[PDB]
Design a protein around this ligand. Structure first.
Ligand SMILES: [Cu+2]
Ligand SMILES: [Cu+2]
Ligand SMILES: [Cu+2]
Ligand SMILES: [Cu+2]
Ligand SMILES: [Cu+2]
Ligand SMILES: [Cu+2]
Lengths: 334, 334, 334
């Protein structure tokens, strides 16, 4: 059909791990969904030690925000590169078909903008990331990636084809950083993004991240920023990793229904303890909480989680179920 | 129902790779299954060179023993930390719901014990491991992990929903160790577990294991301890990795039915050469032997297998099938 | 039945990424398919810098050629080790049952040959590789691996059991190399394969490839050797990795139907952005091109792709579809 005849809806994006307001089941016919993202290069402190990198962001955050549309909507993205930035950027949507995901059509120097439209023909959660020719892993591993969820028009379904409706959704972007080191192993600092390049490449080529974080920093999803839920609530956790494999796990829970590689035409895997999200992929896990208290949500390479940063928390409110679990004899000396 | 009205059965655990006696199809209604594990910190020699680490074990073995119950049984574990040990330990069951898998309820100092009960609500093979707050990867990568199998009450089923019955079951626990090195690359020794900590963390943070072994040591599942079978026997191999991805493969065989991420409500993948078990997961492969002789069972990163230790053997007895394979012309010079 | 009564067909293999002529749906009954491979040890230049390794090849190429048969055909391979070579070699087919995949029956010194027959009882794409006892990862990571496709006799099927017919097929073999370094980090050279051994083992034991390439070298599948297709063509890309995990991704496309672990009795995963092929496995992705232009086909660890070599291109001819994607506002300063 003629795209100009479709409804347009403008979305203002929100900061991860929260997600902009949407409807699981499409209440309108196909639409052009308009999004705007402003690229921001900024200093970010990524650990408790104060280590500070030059981050390359969509909309100021690592990860970039979660976009949400329905299958066969059109995504229309205005991408702005303000003149306060120093580098060339673009955007590649794994949800899109053609022109390197959009990257070939969206190359913006500082002081430029562009508008891309694509049809979201396949349902699922998908990575998007910057990918400037010759510079691709540097931008992605500087934080310049996020995700897009393309919901089926009739919402999510279980392995039997019956509805799965979430009460809450969170987006966990997992970021591998490669902070270059001096000779004894200390992390380095730079005034601008551009004198860092060869040593960034050298650091990346070790294939050994120095930091692996959720929402841009060690401990970002803890304390006053812990994820929350109530006993009995159905929660969808979308998880992306644009460059490197991860293996999410909810400590004390499960993934009741998981699309590990993120594509909703496939039946979900049931009852997962842990699931492999390959680098370059978004996945999604659905869980109904059954117990209150603190949960850790981790990459279950536990070194990556508890030493390098890939760990967050849920604080869950509600009633304790002694049938599911109980201390029979509390720790004591006999 | 009232748990006190259920039958109780006590199980004495056996050493991996063997598995305690059980029934595939449940011959009773739901039960409380009582298990006892005694934590043992001990020196273990892990390679042919004589490299010796301070291992942290459940029941004296790396991995800890395989527990077997049925879906909707209750697992009641008495966990004992004798005063001959030096560290704080606990236990986290990926099969369980709530309180960090049990870890929040089972913190035992040396000289203490505790009893935990949980309902095994989801069928599958699952990791369990120690997880003391602040110290988690150190304990797991010191060997303090095992697995639990929660069988469906009506046993295993194929991709069509028909019964799959095994004749033999083995449990292969795969362990990544991170032995710290001096400056030239030699492995270090320690008198106690506790002066090793910072260098253990430094060694872990390389994300490069020094050793990756089955059943606690290089070559443990070979020679007089090779796994065995007969042509025509149906064998289930449960394989866990509590911290790091693996990719099991039976050299000269297949996984006829594989639950790579271990959860029996999902149909198995058929005819696998190799399967990815993500770190933090147990998986299970079912194979009917069709040829006699030696098989290697490996992590098919062949460096991890043949250089770092992740390789064992089967010795299979029976008749050779020349229809399946034959040497037409034996190696010779013409 | 009596094998001597079956038809025999001789196949002359072709160089990857091309595939020898075959039929998707079997036009004959089961056959003995005769293949001949000549081992060649040779110097190969693997990067733009001129780094040169002693490669160990089947039929002169890295990867070795793709063999194609149908389920329940017999593969009869004449393996020749000319006296111009220096090492012992053999072959292990993950498609085969017994004798370590054939490796136990095919050990050929220089100046020897052998003929192996096996029944291809399981449909799928499978790795084959050399595996001489005591030396296995050295040979595999020197390039001595390829793949075999065992088609169902009635061809490929979708998730609903309907036919999937490809117009073109390519075989992408992905190779992790571990070039040893001097003390500052320079790559080394050797006159013969055999003085390299301990340092090859040391380099492998880092688990950090120095190079990860498609078709044997950085940029091999680009320029005049880019893969090609037309808009509307159905393409099967078979991808193997004999030693190490990979995560293929078609930049600007998808895997419409993917057998990530390569076994055709399983329904394919639909609409994949990226898929995990575990080390020791072959996988296959089916895609119908919908847009023209350049695509990159990568391992989506983008460091592995764009820094270490795991990237190739498609050049696709045809009409552009502005409904699927369009630049609304080309990059400009306002
Ligand atoms: Cu960028
Ligand atoms: Cu990408
Ligand atoms: Cu412990
Ligand atoms: Cu865990
Ligand atoms: Cu060889
Ligand atoms: Cu193999």
């Amino acid at each position: 059909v003629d795209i100009s005849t479709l409804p347009r809806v403008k979305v203002d994006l929100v900061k991860p791990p929260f997600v902009h307001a949407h409807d699981q089941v499409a209440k309108t016919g196909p639409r052009v969904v308009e999004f705007t993202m402003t690229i921001e290069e900024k200093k970010l402190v990524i650990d408790r030690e104060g280590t500070e990198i030059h981050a390359m962001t969509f909309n100021g955050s690592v990860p970039g925000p979660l976009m949400v549309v329905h299958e066969n909507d059109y995504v229309e993205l205005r991408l702005i590169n303000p003149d306060t930035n120093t580098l060339l950027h673009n955007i590649d949507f794994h949800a899109a078909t053609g022109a390197l995901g959009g990257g070939a059509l969206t190359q913006v120097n500082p002081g430029e903008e562009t508008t891309l439209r694509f049809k979201a023909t396949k349902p699922g959660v998908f990575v998007y990331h910057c990918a400037p020719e010759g510079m691709v892993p540097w931008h992605v591993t500087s934080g310049m990636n996020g995700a897009i969820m393309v919901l089926p028009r009739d919402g999510l379904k279980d392995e039997k084809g019956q509805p799965l409706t979430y009460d809450k959704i969170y987006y966990v972007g997992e970021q591998d950083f490669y902070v270059p080191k001096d000779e004894a192993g200390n992390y380095k600092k730079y005034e601008t993004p551009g004198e860092a390049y060869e040593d960034a490449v050298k650091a990346m080529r070790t294939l050994t991240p120095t930091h692996i974080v959720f929402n841009g920093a060690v401990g970002a999803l803890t304390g006053d920023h812990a994820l929350t839920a109530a006993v009995g609530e159905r929660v969808l956790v979308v998880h992306s990793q644009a460059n490197r494999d991860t293996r999410p796990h909810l400590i004390g829970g499960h993934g009741d229904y998981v699309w590990a590689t993120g594509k909703f035409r496939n039946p979900p895997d049931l009852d997962q303890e842990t699931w492999l999200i390959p680098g370059g992929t978004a996945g999604a896990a659905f869980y109904t909480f059954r117990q209150p208290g603190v949960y850790a949500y981790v990459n279950h390479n536990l070194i990556e989680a508890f030493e390098l940063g890939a760990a967050g928390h849920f604080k869950v409110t509600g009633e304790w179920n002694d049938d599911l679990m109980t201390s029979v004899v509390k720790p004591a000396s006999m």
